[PDB]
Amino acid sequence: ERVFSDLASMVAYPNFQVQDKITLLGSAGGDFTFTTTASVVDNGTVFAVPGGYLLRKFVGPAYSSWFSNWTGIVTFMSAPNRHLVVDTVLQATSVLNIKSNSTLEFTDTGRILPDAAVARQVLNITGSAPSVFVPLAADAAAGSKVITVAAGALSAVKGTYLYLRSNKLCDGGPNTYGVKISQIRKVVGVSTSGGVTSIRLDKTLHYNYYLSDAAEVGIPTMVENVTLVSPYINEFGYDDLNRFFTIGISANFAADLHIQDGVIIGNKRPGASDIEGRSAIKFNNCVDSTVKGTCFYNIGWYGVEVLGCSEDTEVHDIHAMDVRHAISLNWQSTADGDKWGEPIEFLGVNCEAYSTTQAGFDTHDIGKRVKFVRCVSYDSAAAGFQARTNGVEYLNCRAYRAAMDGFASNTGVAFPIYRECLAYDNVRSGFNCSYGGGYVYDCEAHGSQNGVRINGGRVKGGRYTRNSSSHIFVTKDVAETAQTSLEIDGVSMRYDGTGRAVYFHGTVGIDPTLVSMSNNDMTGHGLFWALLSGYTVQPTPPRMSRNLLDDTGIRGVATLVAGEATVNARVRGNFGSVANSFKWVSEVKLTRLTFPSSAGALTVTSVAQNQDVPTPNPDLNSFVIRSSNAADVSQVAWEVYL
Amino acid sequence: SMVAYPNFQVQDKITLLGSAGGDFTFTTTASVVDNGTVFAVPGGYLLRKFVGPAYSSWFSNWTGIVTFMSAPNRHLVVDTVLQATSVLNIKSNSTLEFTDTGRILPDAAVARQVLNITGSAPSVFVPLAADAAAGSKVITVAAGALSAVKGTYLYLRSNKLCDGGPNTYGVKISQIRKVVGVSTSGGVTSIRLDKTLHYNYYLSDAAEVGIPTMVENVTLVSPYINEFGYDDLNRFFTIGISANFAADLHIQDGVIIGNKRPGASDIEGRSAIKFNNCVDSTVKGTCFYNIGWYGVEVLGCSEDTEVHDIHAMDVRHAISLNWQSTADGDKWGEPIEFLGVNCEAYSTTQAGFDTHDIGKRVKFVRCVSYDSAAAGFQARTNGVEYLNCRAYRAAMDGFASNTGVAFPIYRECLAYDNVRSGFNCSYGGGYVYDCEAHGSQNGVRINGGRVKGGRYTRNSSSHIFVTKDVAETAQTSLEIDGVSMRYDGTGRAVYFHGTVGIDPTLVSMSNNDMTGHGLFWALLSGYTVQPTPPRMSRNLLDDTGIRGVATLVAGEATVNARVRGNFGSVANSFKWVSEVKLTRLTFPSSAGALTVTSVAQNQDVPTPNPDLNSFVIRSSNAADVSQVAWEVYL
Amino acid sequence: ERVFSDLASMVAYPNFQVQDKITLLGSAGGDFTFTTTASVVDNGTVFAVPGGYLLRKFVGPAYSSWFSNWTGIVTFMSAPNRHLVVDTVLQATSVLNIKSNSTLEFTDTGRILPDAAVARQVLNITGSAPSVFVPLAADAAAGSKVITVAAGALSAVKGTYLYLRSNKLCDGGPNTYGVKISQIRKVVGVSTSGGVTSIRLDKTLHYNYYLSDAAEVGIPTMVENVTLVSPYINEFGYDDLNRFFTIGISANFAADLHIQDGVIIGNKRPGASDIEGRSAIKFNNCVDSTVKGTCFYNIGWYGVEVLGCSEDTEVHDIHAMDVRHAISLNWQSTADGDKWGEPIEFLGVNCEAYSTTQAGFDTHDIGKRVKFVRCVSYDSAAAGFQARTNGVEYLNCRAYRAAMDGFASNTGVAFPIYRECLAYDNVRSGFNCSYGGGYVYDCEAHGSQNGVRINGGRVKGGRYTRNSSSHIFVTKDVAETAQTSLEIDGVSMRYDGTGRAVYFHGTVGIDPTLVSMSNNDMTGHGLFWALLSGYTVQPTPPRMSRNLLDDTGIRGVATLVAGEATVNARVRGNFGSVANSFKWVSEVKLTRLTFPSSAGALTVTSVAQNQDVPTPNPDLNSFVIRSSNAADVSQVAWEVYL
Ligand SMILES: CC(=O)O[C@H]1[C@H](O)[C@H](O[C@@H]2[C@@H](O)[C@H](O)O[C@H](CO)[C@H]2O)O[C@@H](C)[C@H]1O[C@@H]1OC(C(=O)O)=C[C@@H]2O[C@@](C)(C(=O)O)O[C@@H]12
Ligand SMILES: CC(=O)O[C@H]1[C@H](O)[C@H](O[C@@H]2[C@@H](O)[C@H](O)O[C@H](CO)[C@H]2O)O[C@@H](C)[C@H]1O[C@@H]1OC(C(=O)O)=C[C@@H]2O[C@@](C)(C(=O)O)O[C@@H]12
Ligand SMILES: CC(=O)O[C@H]1[C@H](O)[C@H](O[C@@H]2[C@@H](O)[C@H](O)O[C@H](CO)[C@H]2O)O[C@@H](C)[C@H]1O[C@@H]1OC(C(=O)O)=C[C@@H]2O[C@@](C)(C(=O)O)O[C@@H]12
Numbered sequence A, C: 001e002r003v004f005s006d007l008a009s010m011v012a013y014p015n016f017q018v019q020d021k022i023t024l025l026g027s028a029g030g031d032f033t034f035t036t037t038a039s040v041v042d043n044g045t046v047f048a049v050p051g052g053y054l055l056r057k058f059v060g061p062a063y064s065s066w067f068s069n070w071t072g073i074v075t076f077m078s079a080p081n082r083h084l085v086v087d088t089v090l091q092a093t094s095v096l097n098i099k100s101n102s103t104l105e106f107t108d109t110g111r112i113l114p115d116a117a118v119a120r121q122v123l124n125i126t127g128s129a130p131s132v133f134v135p136l137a138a139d140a141a142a143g144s145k146v147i148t149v150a151a152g153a154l155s156a157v158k159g160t161y162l163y164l165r166s167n168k169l170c171d172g173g174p175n176t177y178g179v180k181i182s183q184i185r186k187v188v189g190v191s192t193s194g195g196v197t198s199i200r201l202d203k204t205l206h207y208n209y210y211l212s213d214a215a216e217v218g219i220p221t222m223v224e225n226v227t228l229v230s231p232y233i234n235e236f237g238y239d240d241l242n243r244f245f246t247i248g249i250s251a252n253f254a255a256d257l258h259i260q261d262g263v264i265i266g267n268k269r270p271g272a273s274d275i276e277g278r279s280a281i282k283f284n285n286c287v288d289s290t291v292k293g294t295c296f297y298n299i300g301w302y303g304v305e306v307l308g309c310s311e312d313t314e315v316h317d318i319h320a321m322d323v324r325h326a327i328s329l330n331w332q333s334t335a336d337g338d339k340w341g342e343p344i345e346f347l348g349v350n351c352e353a354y355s356t357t358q359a360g361f362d363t364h365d366i367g368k369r370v371k372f373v374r375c376v377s378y379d380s381a382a383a384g385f386q387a388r389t390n391g392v393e394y395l396n397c398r399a400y401r402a403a404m405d406g407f408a409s410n411t412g413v414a415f416p417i418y419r420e421c422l423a424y425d426n427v428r429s430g431f432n433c434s435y436g437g438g439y440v441y442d443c444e445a446h447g448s449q450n451g452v453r454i455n456g457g458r459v460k461g462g463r464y465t466r467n468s469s470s471h472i473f474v475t476k477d478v479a480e481t482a483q484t485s486l487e488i489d490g491v492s493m494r495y496d497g498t499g500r501a502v503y504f505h506g507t508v509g510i511d512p513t514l515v516s517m518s519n520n521d522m523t524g525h526g527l528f529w530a531l532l533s534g535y536t537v538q539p540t541p542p543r544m545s546r547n548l549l550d551d552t553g554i555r556g557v558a559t560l561v562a563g564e565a566t567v568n569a570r571v572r573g574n575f576g577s578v579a580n581s582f583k584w585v586s587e588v589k590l591t592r593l594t595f596p597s598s599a600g601a602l603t604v605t606s607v608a609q610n611q612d613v614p615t616p617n618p619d620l621n622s623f624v625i626r627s628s629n630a631a632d633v634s635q636v637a638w639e640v641y642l
Numbered sequence B: 001s002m003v004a005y006p007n008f009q010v011q012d013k014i015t016l017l018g019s020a021g022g023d024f025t026f027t028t029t030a031s032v033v034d035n036g037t038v039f040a041v042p043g044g045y046l047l048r049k050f051v052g053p054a055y056s057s058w059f060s061n062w063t064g065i066v067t068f069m070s071a072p073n074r075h076l077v078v079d080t081v082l083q084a085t086s087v088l089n090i091k092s093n094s095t096l097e098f099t100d101t102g103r104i105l106p107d108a109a110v111a112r113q114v115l116n117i118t119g120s121a122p123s124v125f126v127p128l129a130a131d132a133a134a135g136s137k138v139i140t141v142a143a144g145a146l147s148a149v150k151g152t153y154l155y156l157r158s159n160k161l162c163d164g165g166p167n168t169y170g171v172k173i174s175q176i177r178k179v180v181g182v183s184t185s186g187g188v189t190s191i192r193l194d195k196t197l198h199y200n201y202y203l204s205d206a207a208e209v210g211i212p213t214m215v216e217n218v219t220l221v222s223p224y225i226n227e228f229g230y231d232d233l234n235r236f237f238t239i240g241i242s243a244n245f246a247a248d249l250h251i252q253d254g255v256i257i258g259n260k261r262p263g264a265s266d267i268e269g270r271s272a273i274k275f276n277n278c279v280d281s282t283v284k285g286t287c288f289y290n291i292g293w294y295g296v297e298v299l300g301c302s303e304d305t306e307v308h309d310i311h312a313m314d315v316r317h318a319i320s321l322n323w324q325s326t327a328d329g330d331k332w333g334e335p336i337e338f339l340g341v342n343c344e345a346y347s348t349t350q351a352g353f354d355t356h357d358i359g360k361r362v363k364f365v366r367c368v369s370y371d372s373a374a375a376g377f378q379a380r381t382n383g384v385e386y387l388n389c390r391a392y393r394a395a396m397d398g399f400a401s402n403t404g405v406a407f408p409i410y411r412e413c414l415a416y417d418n419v420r421s422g423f424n425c426s427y428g429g430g431y432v433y434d435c436e437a438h439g440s441q442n443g444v445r446i447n448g449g450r451v452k453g454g455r456y457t458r459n460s461s462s463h464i465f466v467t468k469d470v471a472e473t474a475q476t477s478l479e480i481d482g483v484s485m486r487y488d489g490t491g492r493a494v495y496f497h498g499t500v501g502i503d504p505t506l507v508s509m510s511n512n513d514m515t516g517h518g519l520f521w522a523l524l525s526g527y528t529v530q531p532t533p534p535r536m537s538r539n540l541l542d543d544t545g546i547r548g549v550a551t552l553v554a555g556e557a558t559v560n561a562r563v564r565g566n567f568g569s570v571a572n573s574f575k576w577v578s579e580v581k582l583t584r585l586t587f588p589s590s591a592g593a594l595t596v597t598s599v600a601q602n603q604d605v606p607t608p609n610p611d612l613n614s615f616v617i618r619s620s621n622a623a624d625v626s627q628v629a630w631e632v633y634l
Helices: A007-012 A070-077 B062-069 C007-012 C070-077
Strands: A002-004 A022-024 A030-035 A046-049 A052-056 A083-086 A089-091 A102-106 A111-113 A123-126 A146-150 A161-169 A180-193 A196-201 A216-218 A223-229 A249-252 A254-260 A263-265 A281-284 A290-292 A295-297 A302-307 A311-316 A319-321 A325-329 A344-349 A352-354 A361-363 A368-373 A376-378 A393-395 A398-400 A405-408 A417-419 A422-424 A429-433 A438-441 A444-446 A450-454 A457-460 A463-465 A470-474 A486-489 A500-505 A515-518 A530-533 A543-545 A555-559 A564-568 A587-592 A602-608 A622-627 A635-641 B014-016 B022-027 B038-041 B044-048 B075-078 B081-083 B094-098 B103-105 B115-118 B125-127 B138-142 B153-161 B172-185 B188-193 B208-210 B215-221 B241-244 B246-252 B255-257 B273-276 B282-284 B287-289 B294-299 B303-308 B311-313 B317-321 B336-341 B344-346 B353-355 B360-365 B368-370 B385-387 B390-392 B397-400 B409-411 B414-416 B421-425 B430-433 B436-438 B442-446 B449-452 B455-457 B462-466 B478-481 B492-497 B507-510 B522-525 B535-537 B547-551 B556-560 B579-584 B594-600 B614-619 B627-633 C002-004 C022-024 C030-035 C046-049 C052-056 C083-086 C089-091 C102-106 C111-113 C123-126 C133-135 C146-150 C161-169 C180-193 C196-201 C216-218 C223-229 C249-252 C254-260 C263-265 C281-284 C290-292 C295-297 C302-307 C311-316 C319-321 C325-329 C344-349 C352-354 C361-363 C368-373 C376-378 C393-395 C398-400 C405-408 C417-419 C422-424 C429-433 C438-441 C444-446 C450-454 C457-460 C463-465 C470-474 C486-489 C500-505 C515-518 C530-533 C543-545 C555-559 C564-568 C587-592 C602-608 C622-627 C635-641
Touching: A002 A007, A007 A022, A007 A046, A070 A083, A070 A089, A123 A223, A249 A254, A254 A281, A325 A352, A398 A405, A405 A422, A422 A429, A429 A438, A429 A444, A438 A450, A444 A450, A450 A457, A463 A470, A500 A515, A543 C635, A555 A564, A587 A602, A587 B594, A602 C587, A635 B535, B062 B075, B062 B081, B115 B215, B115 B246, B125 B138, B241 B246, B246 B273, B390 B397, B397 B414, B414 B421, B421 B430, B421 B436, B430 B442, B436 B442, B442 B449, B455 B462, B492 B507, B547 B556, B579 B594, B579 C602, B627 C543, C002 C007, C007 C022, C007 C046, C070 C083, C070 C089, C123 C223, C123 C254, C133 C146, C249 C254, C254 C281, C325 C352, C398 C405, C405 C422, C422 C429, C429 C438, C429 C444, C438 C450, C444 C450, C450 C457, C463 C470, C500 C515, C555 C564, C587 C602
Parallel strands: A002 A022, A083 A102, A089 A111, A102 A223, A123 A249, A223 A254, A249 A281, A254 A290, A263 A295, A281 A302, A290 A311, A295 A319, A302 A325, A311 A344, A319 A352, A325 A361, A344 A368, A352 A376, A368 A393, A376 A398, A393 A417, A398 A422, A405 A429, A417 A438, A422 A444, A429 A450, A438 A457, A444 A463, A450 A470, A457 A486, A470 A500, A486 A515, A500 A530, A515 A543, B075 B094, B081 B103, B094 B215, B115 B241, B215 B246, B241 B273, B246 B282, B255 B287, B273 B294, B282 B303, B287 B311, B294 B317, B303 B336, B311 B344, B317 B353, B336 B360, B344 B368, B360 B385, B368 B390, B385 B409, B390 B414, B397 B421, B409 B430, B414 B436, B421 B442, B430 B449, B436 B455, B442 B462, B449 B478, B462 B492, B478 B507, B492 B522, B507 B535, C002 C022, C083 C102, C089 C111, C102 C223, C123 C249, C223 C254, C249 C281, C254 C290, C263 C295, C281 C302, C290 C311, C295 C319, C302 C325, C311 C344, C319 C352, C325 C361, C344 C368, C352 C376, C368 C393, C376 C398, C393 C417, C398 C422, C405 C429, C417 C438, C422 C444, C429 C450, C438 C457, C444 C463, C450 C470, C457 C486, C470 C500, C486 C515, C500 C530, C515 C543
Antiparallel strands: A022 A030, A030 A052, A046 A052, A146 A196, A161 A180, A161 A216, A180 A196, A555 A635, A564 A622, A587 A635, A602 A622, B014 B022, B022 B044, B038 B044, B125 B208, B138 B188, B153 B172, B153 B208, B172 B188, B547 B627, B556 B614, B579 B627, B594 B614, C022 C030, C030 C052, C046 C052, C133 C216, C146 C196, C161 C180, C161 C216, C180 C196, C555 C635, C564 C622, C587 C635, C602 C622
C-alpha cells in the first residue's frame, strides 16, 4: 500500500518491493508494478526508481496524458505493437516514428502541434529499399504468380515482402524522366527444386521482368499494419505563431497503412504561395494503403501525394481546401540518378477540392490503372482534373469554375476517358483532350468558351450548353500534334443563343473530313452550325448522318403533279466558296406513300433559301421533289435532316 | 453513503463499491455535480479517476447523464438501458457511443425530442462591403464590423431567392463557411473562406454576414433510440436526433424505432434524424423503423451532407430534402451538395427518396425503393441526378418529377412493376439515359427531353408515352434514340397523347429496336386531325424478310419482304412507310436511278401474313437488269 | 484488503467473504468480488474458489489476456451480450461460438491460431431453422407487407424473426437442383381480428407465397447483432506447421453480422488444389450482413460464400489471393433431400481477386438482384467473372489475363448485363455471353482471341482492339442454343493490324440477318470487316446502316457532265458468291449542291476496286454517279459509308 500525490515523490521511494500495491495521484495517475527487470523508460508507462522500474498496470491503449513529455511519447512509439491514444495537446520537438502493428488514435481534443522553431516532418512511417539485389533465375512475364532465384541467394520468408526491379521503363505514361520499373510483393509460398527457389507471390507481376533488363529482387524493410485514427496535426491560428511543418505524415515502404479522418492544417500561410515538397500526406512505395475522410487546409504542396511503386492505394471522402493539388500521383526526378517505381492501381472516390492553386486532382507522367470516381473540384486556379499519364479514367466527376479547363490532359498524354463527367462554368473548356486524343462519353459541359477541345477520339452522347465559341472545338495543343479520327455521335449541342455546334481549327491543320457527325441534336444553329478559322481553301466537310438542325418545317407530305412539287420547309445549305465555310445541304429523306403507275425515281432539287432583309424567314425556304417520270402523281413523305 | 463522509482530504485514495463503483479524488475546487463523475460531499467534491471514456453505468440517473453531456469535450459510452425524462443535448468535440446492449428509451410521460445538437444563428449581421460573386474565396466587411476568428464560422445571407428549384415559398439564400484567413487594409477586412460561395452575394440584395455559434465535431456511434415493443408501452418521441447549426456531425449505424405505431398514420415533423443548417455532416448505416415522418430530413443551408447505407422501413420518406414555410416570415437556406448512396427503403407511405422544391447538386447513387405507396423517387427541385437507382412496385411511378420541376437526370436506373410508370418526367422534361422500365402501364411518361438507350418491356399501354401532366405544360423536342422497345405481347412502342396537345413532329426516333410491333408501333388518342409523324431514321421494325437481293427484269422487280405502312386518313393514326435502303450490286450499262413503289400488304383472313407483303423496285431505265440489295427499316 | 501475488494463491484462499476487497497483482491481474451465486467459470472473468466464485470487476470490454486458456474464451463467448478484445495470440482447440449482441475485436497482435491436430471451424455464428411451421392462412403475393396465420397458431413477437417457405422453386436462375423458396423477415407489427393474426413485416415478400404451394412460416432462432472487428485467423508460415482449418467464419441464421477488415489465411497449402467446402467466410441464411475490407490468402474454397436465403448481403473492399472464387453465391445440392433459399439483393463493391483457381467472382444457378460494382479480377485460371444466375449486373468491373473469358455466363444462363466493364488480355474472350444472350453496354475488350462472344442481345457503344480473330464473334456455346436478334450499334471496332470486326459462325447455325449493325467505327478493315466460317451456301448479310469503313476518300463533290461523273473514292464491296463471304457494297449518300434545269434522279453504278498484288491501292478505287437526265450537270456531294 504505497500512495503518492505526485510523480517526484513516487520515483524517489527506495523501498519498492515486487508485491507492493503502488498508486500515483494527479493528471498522469494510475497503478504501478515494481520490477528489477531492465525496462525501457519513457516516463509514461515505465519510470526509473531506486533498485528498479515502475511499470504502469493497464490493458487496452496507452494515453498521452500518462507521459511527462514529448520525448517519452517518441520513446514509447519507437517499439512495435503500440496502441497510443492522444488525449492531450502535444507539442512536438522532433519527428514521431511509428513502427509495425501500431495504432495512433486521437480523441476530439488530442493534437500534435508542430515545432514553431524548425519546420520538420510530424509523423513518419519509414521502411527502406533493399541494400542488395539478386538476379532472377529466369524471365518472369507479366501475370507471373511465381518468381525464381538461385537456391540460397535470397532469404525469402512467408508473410514478408520482396522488391523487384529492372531497367525496363515505367510504361503508364510518357515518363519523361525515364523512371524504371519496380513492384513490392508479399511472399506467400516457397519451394526449391533443382537448385532453384520458386517464390509464390500474393499478387501477380504487372510488367515483364526479364533478364535482358537486368531483372532482380531484394528484401526491403517494410513497416506494416499502422493505423492512424483521426490524426489532428496543427491547429487554426498556427500562422500567427509561425508554426509550420514540412510533410505531415510521410510513409516510405509501408504496407497496410490506413489513415482515417483527422485534420491536417497549415504548412504554408493561408492563401500563400506553394512550397515544393510540403505535402500533407505522402505515400512513397506503399502498398494496400489508404486515406479515408481526412480534411486538409492551407497546404503548401499536395494533400495526398502518391509516388514510387505505390500499389492498391485508395483515397476516399477527403476534403481539401487551399492546397496545390488535393491528390497528386507523382513522378521522380532522375536529374541526380536512376529512380524506380510508378503508382499502380489507384482509386480516388468521393473527394472534394476547393481553391487549389494548381489542378484539383492530378497525375504526373507515370502511373497505371488510375481512376477517379465521383470527385469534385471547385474554383481551381488551373484545371479541375489533370491527367499526365495515359488512359486515366474518370467516372461521374464534376468540375466547377476552373480558371482553365474542367478536365484536361497535357503535352504528349494519350486518351483520358471521361464517363458521365460534368463541367460547369470552367473558363476555357469543360474537357481539353486536344493533346493526344480523348474519349468523352455522355459528358456535359456548360458555361465555357468551348465545351470540349479535342484533336481525335470520340464524343458520344452528352449535352452541351452556354459555350460562347462552340460546343465542340476540333483543335490541337500545338500544330505538330497529330489529328486522328473523331466521332461525334448522339451529342446534344443545340443552339441556345451562344456558340456554334462545332469549330474546325484550320490554323493548326484540322481536316474536317477526319470528323464524322451522326445523330446529333444541333437544333437552332441554322446556317451557323459550324465555325471555321485559318483555312486557305474551302475544306471538305465531315461525313454527316441524320443530325437534327431544325424543329419546324421538317416533316410533311407533298403530292406530285406532272412529276414535281415545291415544298416549303426548313431545308438548308451553303453553296458558296468562302474559305472558312463548308459547302453542304440538308439530307432530305423521301418515301413514297401512294403508288400510281407513273411512279419514278425521286430527287431533291431547286433548294431555295429566303433572304428577306433585314432578317431571313426560313419557313419560306423551299425545295423541289422531282420524279424521273414526268407523269408522276405520287404522294411523297419528306423528312429534313442534316 | 460516500457523499456523507465528513472528513475527506486531498491526499486520500477513495473507493466506491457497487454498479457505479470506482476510485475517487477529493477536491475543494468548484465542480459540476452529475452523480457519476462528480459527487458533492461535505466541504467539497469527489471526482472519479479515469482515462478514456465515461460510462453510463457510472451515473445514478438520466439527469446526471444530461448534466455530463451539457459540456463540450465529452466521450460517453452508453453501456446500460437509459430511461429518458428530458432531452439529451450534445455539445462540441463530443462522442456518444453505444455498446451492443446500451439504449435510450424515450420519456413515456411526455413525447419529446431525444437527442439535440444545437448551435445558434448569429445575433447580429453586418453588410458585405462589396459584391461577392459565385466562386468568391474571400468576402469583405468594414474594418472593425466584426471579429472573424480563424477556425470559426460565418453565416452569409441575402434577399436573393434560392435557385435550386421552383422555390414556391420564396426561401432566401444562405450559406455557412469557415474562416481560414483574415487581413485588414485600408478600412476593409478581407476574410478568406474554406469553401467558395455558390451564389452571387450582392449589396443590392442586402448581402450580409454574421457569426453563428456552431456545435462542431460530434460523433454518434450506434445510437439505439427506443426498442421493439415500444407501442405496447405507448412510448413514442417526436424527433429522434435534431441538429441545427452543426458542423462535422457524423452518425454511424444504430437503430431508431417507433415515433408512430407500426403501419400507423404519419405525424407532421416527426423525423428520425433532422439536419437543419448542418455542414460536412453524415448518416452512415443507420436503420429506421416505424417513423411518423422522414428517416433523414435535410433542410436549411445544409451543405456537403451525405447519407450512406441506411435501411428505412415503414416511414414517410426514407430521405427528404425539405423546404421551409415562409407563411410567418422570411426563411433562409436550401441544401447544397447532397449525396444519398446505397440506401434502401421499404413500404414508405410517400416517396421513398424525396426532395421538396429547393436544393442544389442533389445526387442519389445506387439507392433502392420497394413498395412505396407513392413514387419510389420524387424530385421537386431541378436537375436531380440518379445513378444506377432502382424502384420496385411503387403504387404510382418508379421515378417522378412533379408540377413545375425541370429535367431530372436518370442514368442506368431500373424500374420494375411500378403500377403507373417507370419514369414520369412529364411535368417539365427529363433526361432518361440507358434506363429500363418493366411491368408498368407505360415505361416512360415524358413531355420533352431525351430517352437514349435502355430497354423497356411488359408495359401494358406503351413503352414510351409522350404526354404532359396538364395540357398547359409546354411540349419541347423529344429525342428517342437507341432504345430497345420491342413487342413482347404487351403495349405499343410509343403513345402520342393528342388529348393534351402533343405534336408528334417534335419527336425524333432514330436507331430504336421496335421489332415485332408491325403496324401497331404507335398508339394515338385525342387527335381530331391526322397528325404528321415524328422524324424516323433507321429503326428496326421486323427481324425476318428484311434483307435480300433482287434482280431487275426490264427495269423492275417485285420483292416479297416485311415492308410496312399505313396510308389511311384516320385521325388517331400516322401515314408512314418503311425506309427501304437500296444498293446496286451489278453494273450493267442500263443502270438507272432506283425507287420503291407498289407497297402491298397481305390481308389473310384469320391472320395476315407479312412474309407475303411486297414492294417493287423500279429503275428510271426501262432496260435495267441490275442486281439490287434491299434492306428494310422504319 | 486481500491482495494476492499469483492466481494459484488467490483461488486456493479458503476464507473469502462478500465484503472482501480482493486484488490480483501481475499477470491477468485486477480487482475481484466474491459471490456464492452459481457463476459460469471461465478462468478470466469468473474463477471457482472455496465456497463460491470470484468475479472480475470491470467496465468496457473484456480482454483475452485475462484468461488462463482457450477453453475459457469459448466459455465466455458462449453467452450473448459479450464484448471481448483479443489482445493475445490464442491457440484454438475447439470452435469458438459467438452469440447475439456480441463484439469480438482484435488488436494488432491478437490472433486465433487454428489447431494443427484437427482441421475444424474457427468462428461459428449459428442460429437454427424453425422447429415447427404453420400454414399461411391466405395467399401472400410478392410485395405483401403482411402475412396471415390462424389466431393462436404461432406467437409472433415484435422485433423477432420469421422464416417463410413454400414448394415454389427459386426463380433467380436455371435452378437445376430445384431449390425451393424461403425468406427471413422481422416482425414489426401484430394484430388479431376474426380468428386471423396479421403479422406486419420489416420488408416485403419477394415471391408469391401460395397455399397451393404449401406456403408456411416458422420462428427461427437467429443470432443477431454480431460485430467482428479485424479478425486475424491463422498466420503466414502455417503450412510449415501443417496448421489448417475448414471454414474460418461460418454463419447460419444470423442477422446484422458485420465483419470489418482482418486477415484469414491458410486452410490449404499455398497454390495447392481446391478443397471442397473450405471457405473463409460462409453466410448461410443471413440477413443484413456484410464483409468489408477483409483480406484472404491461400483458401481451399471461396473467400466469401453466400447461400440459402441470404438477403441484403454486401461485400466491400476485399482482397483475395489464391482462392477458388473470391466471392461465390451458391446453390444447395438436393441429392439427399429438399433445400430452400437463394440469395436476394447482393452487392460486391471495390473487391480485388488475384490468382483464383476458378472464376474470380461467381454465382451458381440461383440468386436474385446480384450486382458487382468496380470489382477487379487478375490472372484467374478460369473466368474473371462467372454468372450462372439470370440477369447479373456488372458496373465498371475489370478483368485481366483470365485463362478463359474476362466475363462469362454459362450453359442455360440468360442475359448478364455489363456496363462500362473493361477486359484486358483475357486469353479467349473479353465477354462470353454466347450461352443465352447478353447486354454489353459501353464495354471494352483488348488482347483476346475475340472481344465479345455473343448469340443474341446487344453490343452498344464501347471499344475493341487487339483481338486476334475478331472484335465481335456471333456464335453459340452449342448449336442447339437459340440465336436471337443482335444489335451492334455505336461500337468502335477498328482495324489495328489484328482481327476482323465481326465473325459470323455458320458452323453453329448463325443467320447473319438476325444481326443489325448501325453507326459502328470499322475503319481500316477494308474488304475484310467480316469473317465467316462453316457456311455451305452464301448467307445474306446483316442490315447495315451508316457505319464507317474508311477514313480517306470518303467525302467530296463531283460535277456531272452529260449526266455522269467518275469519282475516285474508297468505295468498297464484294460481288462474289463464295459461301464464307457476304455480297455487299458501300452506302453512298448523294446530295445535290447545284440546281440546273437538267437535274435528275441520282444513282451509284460502276464500282471499281483496285486489286494490285501484293498491295491493293484504295486511292485508285472509283464509282460513277449517274443521273436519270442525260443532260444533268449538277454538282453532287458524296459520302461513303458501310
Ligand atoms: C522523395 C522526393 O524527392 O520527393 C520530392 C517531392 O515528390 C517533390 O517533387 C517535386 C514534384 O512534386 C514536382 O512536381 O516535380 C519536381 C521535379 O520536376 C519534384 O521536385 O518535391 C521535392 C522537393 C521532393 O520533396 C522532398 O521529399 C522529402 C521526403 O522526405 O520525401 C523531403 C523534403 O522536404 C522538403 C519540403 C524540402 O526539404 O524541401 O521537400 C521534400
Ligand atoms: C420484381 C419482380 O418480382 O418481377 C417479376 C415480375 O413481376 C414477373 O413475375 C412473374 C409473374 O409475371 C408470373 O405471372 O408469376 C410468376 C411466378 O409467381 C412471377 O415470377 O416476372 C418475373 C420474371 C419477375 O420479373 C423479373 O424480376 C426481376 C427482379 O429483380 O425481381 C428482374 C427481372 O428483369 C426482367 C425485366 C428480365 O430481364 O426478364 O424481368 C424481371
Ligand atoms: C451447407 C453445405 O452443404 O455446404 C456445402 C458447401 O456449400 C459446398 O457445396 C458445394 C458447392 O460449393 C459446389 O459448387 O457444388 C457442390 C454440389 O455440386 C456442393 O457440394 O461444399 C459442400 C461440401 C458443403 O460444405 C460443407 O458445409 C459445412 C457447413 O458447416 O456448412 C461444413 C463442411 O465442412 C467441409 C469442409 C467438409 O466437411 O468437408 O465442407 C463443409
